[PDB]
Design a protein around this ligand. Sequence first.
Ligand SMILES: NC(=O)C1=CN([C@@H]2O[C@H](COP(=O)(O)OP(=O)(O)OC[C@H]3O[C@@H](n4cnc5c(N)ncnc54)[C@H](O)[C@@H]3O)[C@@H](O)[C@H]2O)C=CC1
Ligand SMILES: NC(=O)C1=CN([C@@H]2O[C@H](COP(=O)(O)OP(=O)(O)OC[C@H]3O[C@@H](n4cnc5c(N)ncnc54)[C@H](O)[C@@H]3O)[C@@H](O)[C@H]2O)C=CC1
Ligand SMILES: NC(=O)C1=CN([C@@H]2O[C@H](COP(=O)(O)OP(=O)(O)OC[C@H]3O[C@@H](n4cnc5c(N)ncnc54)[C@H](O)[C@@H]3O)[C@@H](O)[C@H]2O)C=CC1
Ligand SMILES: NC(=O)C1=CN([C@@H]2O[C@H](COP(=O)(O)OP(=O)(O)OC[C@H]3O[C@@H](n4cnc5c(N)ncnc54)[C@H](O)[C@@H]3O)[C@@H](O)[C@H]2O)C=CC1
Ligand SMILES: NC[C@H]1O[C@H](O[C@H]2[C@H](O)[C@@H](O[C@H]3O[C@H](CO)[C@@H](O)[C@H](O)[C@H]3O)[C@H](N)C[C@@H]2N)[C@H](O)[C@@H](O)[C@@H]1O
Ligand SMILES: NC[C@H]1O[C@H](O[C@H]2[C@H](O)[C@@H](O[C@H]3O[C@H](CO)[C@@H](O)[C@H](O)[C@H]3O)[C@H](N)C[C@@H]2N)[C@H](O)[C@@H](O)[C@@H]1O
Lengths: 342, 341, 342, 341
Amino acid sequence: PVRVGVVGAGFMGGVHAEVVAAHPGARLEAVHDLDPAAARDLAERFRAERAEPSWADLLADPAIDLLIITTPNGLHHRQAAEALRAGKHVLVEKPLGVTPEQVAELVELAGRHDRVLAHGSNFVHSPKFVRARQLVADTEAFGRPHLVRVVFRNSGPEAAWAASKDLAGGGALLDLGCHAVELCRWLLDGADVESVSARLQRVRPPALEDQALLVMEFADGAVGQCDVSWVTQGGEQVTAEIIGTKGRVEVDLWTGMGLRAYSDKGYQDVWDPEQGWVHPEWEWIRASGYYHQDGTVIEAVGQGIPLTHGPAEALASARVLATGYRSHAEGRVLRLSGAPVG
Amino acid sequence: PVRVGVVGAGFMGGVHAEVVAAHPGARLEAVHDLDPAAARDLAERFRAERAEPSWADLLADPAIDLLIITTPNGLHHRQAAEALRAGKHVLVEKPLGVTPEQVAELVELAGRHDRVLAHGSNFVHSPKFVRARQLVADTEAFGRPHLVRVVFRNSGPEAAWAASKDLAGGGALLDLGCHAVELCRWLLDGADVESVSARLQRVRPPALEDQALLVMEFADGAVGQCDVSWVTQGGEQVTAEIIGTKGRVEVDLWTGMGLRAYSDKGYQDVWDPEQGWVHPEWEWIRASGYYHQDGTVIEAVGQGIPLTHGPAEALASARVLATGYRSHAEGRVLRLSGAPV
Amino acid sequence: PVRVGVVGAGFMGGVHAEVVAAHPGARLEAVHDLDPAAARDLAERFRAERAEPSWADLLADPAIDLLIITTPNGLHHRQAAEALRAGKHVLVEKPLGVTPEQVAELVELAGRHDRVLAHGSNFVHSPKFVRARQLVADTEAFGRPHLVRVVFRNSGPEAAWAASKDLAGGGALLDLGCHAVELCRWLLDGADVESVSARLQRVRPPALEDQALLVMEFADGAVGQCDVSWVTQGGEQVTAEIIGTKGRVEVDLWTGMGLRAYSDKGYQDVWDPEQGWVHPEWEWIRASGYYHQDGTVIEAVGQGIPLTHGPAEALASARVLATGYRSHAEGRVLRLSGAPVG
Amino acid sequence: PVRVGVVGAGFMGGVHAEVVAAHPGARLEAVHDLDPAAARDLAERFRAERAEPSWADLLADPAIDLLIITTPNGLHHRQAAEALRAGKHVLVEKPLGVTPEQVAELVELAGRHDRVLAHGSNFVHSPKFVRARQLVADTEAFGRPHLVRVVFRNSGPEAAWAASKDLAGGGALLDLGCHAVELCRWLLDGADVESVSARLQRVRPPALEDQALLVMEFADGAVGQCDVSWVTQGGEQVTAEIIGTKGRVEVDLWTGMGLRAYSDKGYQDVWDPEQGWVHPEWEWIRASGYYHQDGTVIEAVGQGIPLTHGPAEALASARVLATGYRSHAEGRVLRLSGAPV
Ligand SMILES: NC(=O)C1=CN([C@@H]2O[C@H](COP(=O)(O)OP(=O)(O)OC[C@H]3O[C@@H](n4cnc5c(N)ncnc54)[C@H](O)[C@@H]3O)[C@@H](O)[C@H]2O)C=CC1
Ligand SMILES: NC(=O)C1=CN([C@@H]2O[C@H](COP(=O)(O)OP(=O)(O)OC[C@H]3O[C@@H](n4cnc5c(N)ncnc54)[C@H](O)[C@@H]3O)[C@@H](O)[C@H]2O)C=CC1
Ligand SMILES: NC(=O)C1=CN([C@@H]2O[C@H](COP(=O)(O)OP(=O)(O)OC[C@H]3O[C@@H](n4cnc5c(N)ncnc54)[C@H](O)[C@@H]3O)[C@@H](O)[C@H]2O)C=CC1
Ligand SMILES: NC(=O)C1=CN([C@@H]2O[C@H](COP(=O)(O)OP(=O)(O)OC[C@H]3O[C@@H](n4cnc5c(N)ncnc54)[C@H](O)[C@@H]3O)[C@@H](O)[C@H]2O)C=CC1
Ligand SMILES: NC[C@H]1O[C@H](O[C@H]2[C@H](O)[C@@H](O[C@H]3O[C@H](CO)[C@@H](O)[C@H](O)[C@H]3O)[C@H](N)C[C@@H]2N)[C@H](O)[C@@H](O)[C@@H]1O
Ligand SMILES: NC[C@H]1O[C@H](O[C@H]2[C@H](O)[C@@H](O[C@H]3O[C@H](CO)[C@@H](O)[C@H](O)[C@H]3O)[C@H](N)C[C@@H]2N)[C@H](O)[C@@H](O)[C@@H]1O
């Protein structure tokens, strides 16, 4: 029975605490936050064994097998390292690190300490994204993939820390692009990136990028687009399309739930937009891949089943983003090494 | 740990076998079919303790707690009765019985032997339908519901038994209408039916009805339509809509998965239509309510949690359909008692 | 050059005045209203030769060839009769009459006076509805039609006269059902109705019906549903579906324009709903059939081209509705004669 | 009454012949093709005064006011120049020329002979695109536009000339991108392009580009994407999206007609895909802007109303594409001048 600690009792600590509490092979043992009242509230809401106010004590406790780190991006590296050095398995929310060297250091650490290190690429475990991938891999029907495009857009993160470079490590390219890049590479069966090209925008007034376009060229000829935004009103969008020589596949997460509703006022449990025509969500957590993700991690820890989607995939995506940031700066298409293609 | 037997190893025996194998609080203990090879196929597919070729032996086995009956409609009554008499809890695929009196007999019989009896109204446990019901029940936004329409259409059941009245008990109204009626009533929080009106069609050549429209009037003023069909090409359709004084809600099961795909050939695990633009399914079983339904039944048996959706609801729907059949015959709007309005 | 008079300078007088002013084979000659200022305003907005304040003078004027009657339903019969007796051709907005006998009287009148009588069934001239009909008539692909359903729903007519039985002649079944019935019969190539069954509701508090369902059985075996409503919020809906032994055809007028837009505030030229996700309209008048309709009528008058969709179709639909009203009262399925089927 | 000659009696000569025949202020006077039988087919189809087998005779005929040029891209320049020199007004299908200098030469040449020169940017006259532009321009609701994306994809041009560089002048970027670029600029009210960046692909075997992505940066901060493809099965796609600080607008031409149909066979007048679920078209020609475009040109010629969308816009787009081609070669983001950013 895998004894789990949640580190950061905010929004994603809550999502993970829910899926942990529901999983028969695990126990929600502890919740820790710098804000001890936020840890207590979440420990209560999901019936955790306890609130643990001390990081040091949490790490020394031999009753904890796995920590889930849901703190602000810029803390991920230090927290995960300390955790792995203390002997704990770790699931870290994306971004696993804020630079490829941060990520590489964690992977090497996890290997040295013989620990499972997993990162929070949940969409890659979304049942509807899994399906879409089988369809593209059905060569008879789809043929050879030549385009993949993944779009993540919303009206921007609300938490104050996501506005500072030291706490967030980057703007929209890092926050949403990490996911878009992973989904492109993974929809094409782990395709190798040969070049990266990107351009960033600052749409909101005075500074982190709040919208970006990043494009990858892959070994086989295919081209991937990642189009991400913190400045799109009207409801979060997560879509993908893949186009091959013979077929097409389209995926829609938030307006492909098969529910529509209309009201003047606004429905009680309905997000944003509030009023008028909306697309209410059912089982958003599962549809988004969190149950399957966390389940994989609980199994990897509980019985050394290797992860299907490892942290090496986080290194590859970190390299892509870092190169995207450079491509924007230099206004050219770059190899992952940083060299210009020409 | 609830020990489960599946009776009828065809399409729905397969669906229930999968959800049973996946449920931690249960064990797929046996599979039985008149065709012992089909039972063995399925027992293997889902790692059942055994294939049980003998109905008698299956019923006497004190290791089974619950049977799930996925045989042709006309057998449901006898099989469920024998099962309850043998001390087993029972989940019966819809229709629970072929007439209200068959259903009432089983409920009473389950009472006598102190057994859980459940019926396979899966859509009422569909996470997306549960959500749609909360939105309708959100009075400030939805206002008062005044219309509900549920549409079930497909190109018709392929099995030969579903073409015979003796084995099927009825045509599309009984087959698909039972679901549509339960969803209308349940979307409106168990609304009381005041009248029923229906017309049936025979579209494909010489005979059971192929297509039907059934309309309920409810106590509060709302009207429910159930529009069902065995003669609709182009992919199964399961949709609902609810309209209130202030809102609307629309529910779409099979073309509201957020996946589209195109090919000339046809994709390996994609149903019907085969070719051209299709809407592939993800997690169809869960989306359709089977995991939550069976879960409820496993919990009712395992730890005496009462069912949220009991077999009395199958009685209410059976009465509705029976009155719909009579409405069609007499060409008039009837009370459940059978009297004309 | 067909010289046209518009009678009733309200909403539909405005729609018709627009299409008349645009048509090269016609001239918007006069506009008449009991409210002479409403006639003047419309005469100006569309450059009519004049505002004609006198009905009698309008009818005696030998310079007018065709009157378009866009007054309240309950005036249609008397106005159209007087017009035809005076020697004028007439297009009457639906409902052409409020009972089958009103309609029959007008048809007989039009024949006696050798005049074109047309009624305002515009959807039957909607280019997208025309297409849908060819697809159903493509027997190879569609097979034999066995179901047709037409849905008209909105939040109800705003004009005061539509709330009185004397001025409106009926509630939603008459107002919206007339159109739904015509589209069902016409989508199936003028199919003969054998039985009618209907039920009406009064949803709004205290009285005319504000929602209805009417079902027709046709000669060939097919069944038609007309589902109409004055109590559906969230935007007007006009849809149809047809299902055959081999095929299906679906038509959507107001959410099948291929435009979507989102705003918090509301866009300047956008209807209802105002805010949030909307489906703005482009060329709604043409998409709805009014240009083609009126064009047919202008040609029938201008050069005795017979109407493709005649007033006999209004008699057939009037009979259907009248029988629907009776079916509701008696709670049974009736033949057009009024007899019960049994 | 504007007397019109159509030059090139293939697919677009057919489209323009239909809108010309239907326009009251014009007459379809002649149709000319290298294939005199194709010219005659079309002259008959649309009741043209005559089939004119001779280019020279067509140009000398003082009865023609306007020629519409619907020949292969590489001929546009020579044909339009000869036509303007012969005193005729000219509407040239896109691309107006194959290089910015070809386009600039024609504009200047039209000026010299005091002639209307128009190019076939039809989507910019599409009633639905015109509407989408008003919504974006509605500042209180939309706020400031910061993204525009236009997508044009199909399974590729079938004619052999469109596979040759000499006859086509370029691959998918020139063919489909010209439209996508004009729509981005025009949706943002004639926005000034500050930079261009593009990458091209060759998807189908050995060669002109099959698929491309071109991205503009605009003066105000907004970014435009043009995503074009000859290698997309499953039906032509023409869509756009615009996103502002407060709103979004989405435009869909071919799957936003409000018609769906299913058959196994295929419906008589339905394009591609043939079978299964399709989106049949109604009034495609009007929806695509051809009636309004040609109307504008007929009015410009007939009664000296200036064009709303002039050939200078074809120069701006030609510069963009030429810089996109260079961007792809050099693998960097370029100013229109050709300089790197
Ligand atoms: N996969 C996905 O879809 C999503 C991932 N995320 C990621 O999840 C992570 C957390 O996101 P949320 O929206 O922020 O939560 P958040 O802002 O709601 O809360 C973070 C919590 O961490 C606590 N905290 C801050 N620093 C701490 C420290 N050094 N030690 C212990 N506790 C600390 C705060 O008091 C707060 O309770 C982020 O890294 C973000 O990238 C966020 C949303 C969705
Ligand atoms: N909830 C839902 O959505 C659906 C429910 N159903 C229902 O499920 C039930 C089974 O339908 P399907 O699985 O489609 O049928 P099926 O034809 O796929 O299989 C029925 C099986 O029962 C076997 N059988 C026949 N007589 C038997 C006997 N005396 N004892 C044991 N087995 C016998 C047959 O050999 C066959 O394998 C029906 O009552 C039907 O109404 C069917 C489809 C969908
Ligand atoms: N085909 C279609 O889609 C539609 C048809 N309609 C129909 O069009 C007709 C008119 O509808 P609108 O919404 O009402 O216009 P409305 O209410 O806006 O105006 C009617 C006009 O008639 C004038 N008027 C009333 N009685 C008159 C009389 N005896 N003589 C001269 N003028 C008179 C009024 O002052 C007013 O200006 C109705 O019959 C309705 O059924 C209405 C909307 C859409
Ligand atoms: N606006 C739009 O949406 C579209 C525009 N186009 C454009 O329209 C133009 C024509 O394309 P399509 O009609 O698809 O071509 P097509 O291949 O259908 O026909 C072109 C015709 O020109 C004829 N021709 C060849 N050389 C000639 C000459 N020297 N003199 C006279 N005629 C000659 C050919 O025989 C052929 O009939 C192209 O410039 C293309 O870029 C094409 C498709 C869509
Ligand atoms: N206004 C709608 C929602 O906006 C925030 O939450 C969304 C999350 O932000 C969203 O995640 C995306 O957005 C976050 C902010 O950009 C990213 O840090 C994250 O990587 C991405 O998947 C989840 N998949 C869906 C959540 N509902 C907000 O935190 C929620 O409380 C709220 O329900
Ligand atoms: N709130 C949206 C609209 O509601 C009314 O107008 C609609 C009209 O009412 C609508 O017609 C339907 O509704 C009318 C009212 O029920 C019926 O009398 C008519 O037979 C039917 O086609 C038109 N086809 C489309 C019009 N936009 C209203 O008159 C308009 O000014 C307004 O644009």
